[PDB]
Design a binder for this molecule. Structure first.
Ligand code: SF4
Ligand code: SF4
Ligand code: FES
Lengths: 73, 116, 688, 119, 216, 121
């Protein structure tokens, strides 16, 4: 990405090599891939598709966090 | 760098120092001590002390008061920059405005330890 | 006495102890708290955990201090090298087979094994062999078992045999393969079956409704009272913010010792459902949310537009004394007199407090050698009181019963079942009268099902004649006791919450009210709430009384307020707020003071202290909290005074003296909303 | 003759001497007058009129002094005077004999389930 | 003004044998015998200077704190020239709930000592500004944090807390989060103090074991 | 004398009785009391996983249900959750007698399931 380059697009199997944490990359090391692994992509901050808590206005259904049930007649 | 010995780096009193992570996952006493040291903590016996260290700005000291609990009853912090900054009234007398910043710089003050 | 207190030496300090005390009790009287796992104050001595080992002079072995009696001039040492080596060795033996389960165990944070290992044990282990693994057991919906954590202290077995009386647990196998439980798949059927979770010192037996929800260090504990029955057991409520997480007993030897029934322990989950949190007024659409000003105005308009003789006020089973005196003063200020109680016998005369209270008290009943129960089932009315009756049975007190035959977990002599049998006992036809006449301190306990009867005055006259002939009440001993099963009844009798003579006459000729105030009432009879009347419901749960009302005023539960309650022995106790008020609810006496202001005749008190001072102005014993007076006894003058109530509504010698509690697990609006109580009933239904 | 050396009236005189400079520096010329300010500061003094100990009187005067120099050195501005000194006084003398016949209890009842904390 | 650089060689020693023996063993008895009216209680404990020794703690009345400190500064055997700090400890169970604590260091003989005065909330302690020049800011901080009044101070005013701050934060009955909080108001265009409200209240964890023996 | 009590004639409100939290087979008998706290009651959430997971995402409980029970020779098994004991859970010793492929034993740390054909069966 020449126009919107960002370090959050570096996968974790290249992150430790590029940050000088270890000397391992996929070209010399076979990493164990979990079946639930989510691939790395660019951050979504500043847009309206960012992470929000469950009590937020931007959620599909906001939560009222009451710990009791009210009586409805 | 030349006299670094081989051996333990932690005190072997398990009622003060937490165990290793392999020991905690294999023996019952280590897991109990891990659970208790990471929640209640050790109990310090009742008493008091003042202990000081030659910190790079001077003498840094802690006055610890113990009633016997797992929490300090009183912890007074003595900072050298607090005493060094008190002198600016007698050190800057007879100086000019462009020497105040030199005096403040040569006293070596950081306001985190001054303002606790 | 031949020196009834003997002197021993604990760490060279002289200690005087009563005779028959053990070494552990002598160490406790010296201010030393000896580690223990199998000893309990309320159970029999076992001596199998070997943690209480101390050193006695001229004995080459460590002695077990819990079991060893203390002799004269004995020298006890609790801090020698052999005592410390013994403690570390016994702890090491306790921990070799224990599972590494502290993260997933519910006792973590309040564990006797953890804390005693930290203090009296070592910091390491040398054990690298494989451990013993045990399958878990099913004991019902209230007790959860992870049996790999058992340390074979046999506290559960001794409890089930001695206090609960069911005797269903045992130790099967031998040696390392000893195993606690029932051999076949069984359900723990005792009403006092949650106490064994407290008695287990480890996480082998934990509370199933509470499981995995909280750690003990996060809980703010409040010392309150229990309102699920009339005994008023002393409890501690543990809350995390606005939510009550568990309820535990606390020590009171004059009331409940250390026990609590399963209803009083597990009904707290009904406080999270069907809660009234907003005021509502019935419109053409139905009940809908309204402001407090609007709801108070509607209630005041209905209370003022009706004639004073068309207003009735009914107190619930859980109303505190402050709200009851507020409602009583508000209705009497309007010229009304129709006061009713949901717990029945609202027209009962309350002139002398000794006639509706336990004169012997709960702890004073233990000095009785013969007990006659009249028409009561104490196992379902108050299981903690029935446990104290079993404790009295185990050390020699004989029990007889006149009433319907019931399982009481101890042997009793069935004298009869009807008031005809009571009259035959008073005349002399049954040999149990001669057993009562020769007893040093006989006792009579009358249950609330007798007072709910239409002919209760004749039955009480027969009981008084029996007590006069058998020496039940004499100089130095008063053995006449009346118990109750509802929390709010005795306070209402104390303050005078009863209907006037005109209101009793109007009910006799069949007058029907148009405005009914329901102070927390959900088990009212249909004769007292007519259809088409205006209903003001003040309460905390949405139930039968709130579905029928026109104005709903949300109040506080007993975990949210500090109200006064009096138990059946006459002791004034109080709740305390463990959580704040829920939603837009208010304090219960405060609603009635605000409503008296909106009506137009203010109550003369503006604070909690002032309404308590009004209560103390009516009856002065209300001011003495956590204490009980000695009530006046007027011999047969009181019975002579109410002979007109004996002549009218005559005796029914064929109707059996029964107990009115037919559903033990669901008695009020809180326990009816509890899912745990419903599972408790379903477990007893699916076993057939 | 005057209890504990008359130190209350001496401190009151000192504050009353200090007051017009406070009014000029904080620019409160068109908000409050010196007469009502003197009455307000007098009303601060009457709250401790029943102190039976002279050491408590000396401590109270020392603390009131330190309050008056933190007002003199512009370490609290005019909005601090508004929100802490004169509007509590005007609220305590403005709500007296209100236009509504509601008792204080019923206003508290309609406000919330609990009493108000602070100001 | 002591401990001038005198030896030009490396020194492999701390103190002399006779003076170190006197300071580590006999100093408590010496101070008690020479000035008995100044001393009301003494504790010899685990030694501020090092983990290997013992050092005294002297209790005195406020009426004799200044003469005792002058004696401890100027006497030839106790040359305590440096005052390291002044602080207080709150004991709400006592009739006099405060203990004002003074630490001292002797550069002449490598020693340390601790001096205590017990007062309540309304008893003044004499200032040590004339004896030690650092006593100024420490007494100002002690007045700020605990409300201990030091009589004879040149300018006793608060030094650490906020400008309008009433209340002494290090007392045991003062709340950890306080009573007021601070925000900007767009309407008043000023930073304003308001009564405290917390989005998440502080969770107090009560960890203490009912078998623990050390609690005093 | 002492007549039996009929529990089947005891009334239970229908709103309460239909809302009992129960369990599937797992580590308990199927249908026993499931402990719950108050979280999610205001939003009408009676399920454990729905209280923190939003959407049609695969739950952790559905992940562990796809791993078959493991055949172990012996009477007791030690569960670490990893090949390396330093990287897993504290060791759990799980009883294997009375177990089969249909009714295996489950680790309370990891949710892995084990059984043995060694208890004369
Ligand atoms: S009973 Fe539970 S909390 Fe206590 S030591 Fe055993 S595993 Fe840990
Ligand atoms: S289950 Fe608990 S009470 Fe029963 S023997 Fe085991 S450790 Fe003791
Ligand atoms: S407490 Fe005595 S042997 Fe267990």
């Amino acid at each position: 990405d020449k126009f919107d380059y960002n370090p959050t697009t570096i996968p974790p199997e290249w992150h430790g090599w590029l940050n000088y944490i270890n000397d391992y990359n996929p070209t010399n090391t076979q990493f164990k891939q979990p079946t639930y692994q989510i691939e790395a992509s660019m951050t979504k901050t500043g847009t309206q598709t960012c992470y929000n808590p469950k009590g937020s206005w931007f959620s599909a259904k906001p939560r009222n966090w009451r710990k009791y049930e009210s009586w409805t007649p | 760098l030349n006299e670094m010995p081989d051996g333990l780096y932690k005190s072997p009193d398990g009622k003060v120092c937490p165990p290793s992570r392999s020991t905690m996952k294999q023996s019952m006493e280590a897991l109990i001590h891990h659970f208790k040291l990471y929640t209640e903590g050790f109990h310090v016996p009742a008493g008091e002390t003042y202990r000081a260290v030659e910190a790079p700005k001077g003498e840094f000291g802690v006055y610890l008061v113990s009633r016997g609990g797992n929490r300090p009853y009183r912890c007074k912090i003595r900072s050298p920059g607090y005493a060094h900054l008190q002198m600016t009234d007698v050190i800057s007398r007879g100086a000019m405005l462009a020497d105040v910043v030199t005096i403040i710089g040569t006293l070596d003050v950081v306001f985190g330890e001054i303002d606790r | 006495p031949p020196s009834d207190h003997l002197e021993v030496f604990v760490n060279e300090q002289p200690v005087k102890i009563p005779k028959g005390s053990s070494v552990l009790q002598a160490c406790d009287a010296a201010g030393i708290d000896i580690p223990r796992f199998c000893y309990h104050q309320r159970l029999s001595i076992a001596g199998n955990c070997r943690m209480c080992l101390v050193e006695v002079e001229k004995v080459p072995k460590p002695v077990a201090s819990c079991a060893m009696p203390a002799g004269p001039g004995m020298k006890i040492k609790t801090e020698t090298p052999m005592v410390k080596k013994a403690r570390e060795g016994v702890m090491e033996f306790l921990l070799i087979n224990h599972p590494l389960d502290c993260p997933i165990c519910d006792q973590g944070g309040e564990c006797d094994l953890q804390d005693q290992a930290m203090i009296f044990g070592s910091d390491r282990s040398r054990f690298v062999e494989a451990k013993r693994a045990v399958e878990d057991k099913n004991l019902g919906p209230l007790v959860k078992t992870v049996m790999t954590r058992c340390i074979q202290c046999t506290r559960c077995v001794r409890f089930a045999s001695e206090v609960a009386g069911t005797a269903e647990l045992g130790v099967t196998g031998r040696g390392r393969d000893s195993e606690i439980g029932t051999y076949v798949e069984k359900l723990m059927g005792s009403e006092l079956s949650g106490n064994v979770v407290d008695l287990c010192p480890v996480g082998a037996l934990t509370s199933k409704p509470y499981a995995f929800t909280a750690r003990s260090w996060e809980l703010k504990g409040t010392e309150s009272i229990d309102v699920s029955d009339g005994l008023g057991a002393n409890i501690r409520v543990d809350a995390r913010g606005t939510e009550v997480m568990r309820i535990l007993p606390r020590l009171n030897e004059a009331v409940n010792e250390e026990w609590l029934s399963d209803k009083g322990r597990y009904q707290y989950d009904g406080l999270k459902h069907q809660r009234l949190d907003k005021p509502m007024v019935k419109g053409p659409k139905g009940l809908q949310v309204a402001t407090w000003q609007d709801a108070l105005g509607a209630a005041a308009a209905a209370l003022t537009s009706a004639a004073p003789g068309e207003v009735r006020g009914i107190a619930g089973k859980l109303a505190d004394a402050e709200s009851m005196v507020a409602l009583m003063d508000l209705l009497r200020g309007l010229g009304a007199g129709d006061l009713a109680h949901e717990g029945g016998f609202s027209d009962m005369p309350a002139d002398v407090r000794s006639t509706y209270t336990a004169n012997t008290t709960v702890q004073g009943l233990e000095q009785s050698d013969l007990v006659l129960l009249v028409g009561t089932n104490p196992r379902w009315e108050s299981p903690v009181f029935n446990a104290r009756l079993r404790k009295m049975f185990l050390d020699g007190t004989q029990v007889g019963l006149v009433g319907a035959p019931v399982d009481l977990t101890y042997k009793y002599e069935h004298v009869g079942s009807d008031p005809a049998a009571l009259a035959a006992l008073a005349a002399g036809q049954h040999p149990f009268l001669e057993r009562l006449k020769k007893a040093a301190r006989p006792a009579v306990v009358v249950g609330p099902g007798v007072l709910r009867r239409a002919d209760r005055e004749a039955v009480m006259k027969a009981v008084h004649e029996l007590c006069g002939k058998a020496g039940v009440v004499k100089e130095g001993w008063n053995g006449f006791n009346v118990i109750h099963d509802t929390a709010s009844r005795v306070a209402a009798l104390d303050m005078g919450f009863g209907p006037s003579a005109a209101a009793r006459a109007r009910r006799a000729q069949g007058a029907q009210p148009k405005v009914v105030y329901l102070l927390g009432s959900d088990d009212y009879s249909e004769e007292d709430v007519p259809e088409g009347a205006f209903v003001i419901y003040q309460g905390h749960h949405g139930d039968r009384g709130a579905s029928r009302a026109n104005v709903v005023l949300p109040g506080a539960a007993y975990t949210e307020k500090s109200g006064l309650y009096v138990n059946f022995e006459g002791r004034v106790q109080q709740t305390r707020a463990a959580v704040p008020l829920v939603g837009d609810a208010r304090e219960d006496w405060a609603i009635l003071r605000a409503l008296s202001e909106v009506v137009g005749k203010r109550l003369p008190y503006d604070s909690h202290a002032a309404v308590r001072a009004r209560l103390a102005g009516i009856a002065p014993h209300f001011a003495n909290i956590d204490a009980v007076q000695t009530p006046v006894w007027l011999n047969g003058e009181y019975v002579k005074g109410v002979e007109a109530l004996a002549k009218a509504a005559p005796l029914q010698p064929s109707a059996p003296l029964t107990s009115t509690i037919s559903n033990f697990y669901m008695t009020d609006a809180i326990s009816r909303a509890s899912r745990t109580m419903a599972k408790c009933i379903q477990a007893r239904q699916q076993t057939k | 003759k005057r209890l504990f050396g008359g130190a209350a009236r001496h401190f009151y005189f000192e504050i009353c001497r200090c007051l017009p400079f406070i009014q000029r520096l904080h620019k409160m010329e068109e908000m409050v007058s010196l007469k009502e300010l003197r009455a307000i500061v007098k009303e601060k003094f009457k709250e401790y009129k029943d102190v039976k100990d002279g050491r408590v009187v000396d401590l109270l005067i020392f603390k009131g002094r330190e309050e008056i120099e933190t007002y003199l050195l512009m370490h609290k501005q005019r909005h601090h005077v508004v929100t802490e000194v004169v509007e509590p006084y005007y609220a305590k003398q403005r709500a007296v004999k209100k236009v509504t016949t509601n008792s204080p209890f019923l206003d508290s009842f309609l406000s919330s389930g609990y009493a108000a904390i602070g100001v | 003004g002591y401990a001038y650089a005198r030896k030009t060689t490396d020194k492999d020693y701390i103190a002399s044998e006779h003076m170190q023996a006197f300071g580590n063993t006999q100093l408590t008895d010496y101070i008690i015998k020479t000035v008995p009216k100044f001393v009301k209680m003494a504790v010899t404990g685990p030694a501020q200077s090092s983990v290997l020794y013992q050092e005294p703690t002297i209790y005195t009345t406020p009426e004799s704190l200044v003469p005792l400190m002058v004696f401890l500064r100027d006497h030839t055997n106790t040359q305590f020239k440096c005052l390291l700090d002044v602080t207080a400890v709150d004991f709400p169970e006592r009739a006099a709930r405060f203990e004002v604590v003074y630490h001292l260091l002797s550069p002449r003989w490598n020693n340390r000592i601790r001096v205590k005065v017990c007062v309540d909330e309304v008893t003044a302690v004499p200032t040590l500004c004339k004896v030690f020049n650092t006593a100024n800011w420490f007494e100002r901080e002690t007045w700020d944090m605990f409300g201990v009044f030091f009589s004879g101070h040149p300018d006793l005013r608060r030094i650490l807390t906020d400008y309008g701050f009433t209340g002494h934060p290090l007392r045991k009955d003062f709340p950890m989060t306080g009573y007021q909080e601070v925000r900007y108001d767009y309407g008043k265009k000023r930073v304003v103090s308001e009564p405290l409200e917390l989005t998440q209240e502080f969770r107090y964890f009560d960890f203490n074991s009912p078998w623990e023996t050390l609690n005093r | 004398v002492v007549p039996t009590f009929d529990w089947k004639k005891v009334p239970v409100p229908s709103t309460t009785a239909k809302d009992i939290p129960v369990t599937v087979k797992g580590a308990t008998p199927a249908g026993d009391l499931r402990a719950t706290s108050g979280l999610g009651l205001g939003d009408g959430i009676k399920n454990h996983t729905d209280k923190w997971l939003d959407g049609d995402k695969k739950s952790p409980m559905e992940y562990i249900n796809e791993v078959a029970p493991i055949k172990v020779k012996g009477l007791v098994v030690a569960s670490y959750g990893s090949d390396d004991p330093a990287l897993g859970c504290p060791v759990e010793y799980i009883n294997l007698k009375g177990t089969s492929l249909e009714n295996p034993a489950v680790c309370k740390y990891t949710g892995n399931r084990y059984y043995s054909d060694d208890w004369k069966g």
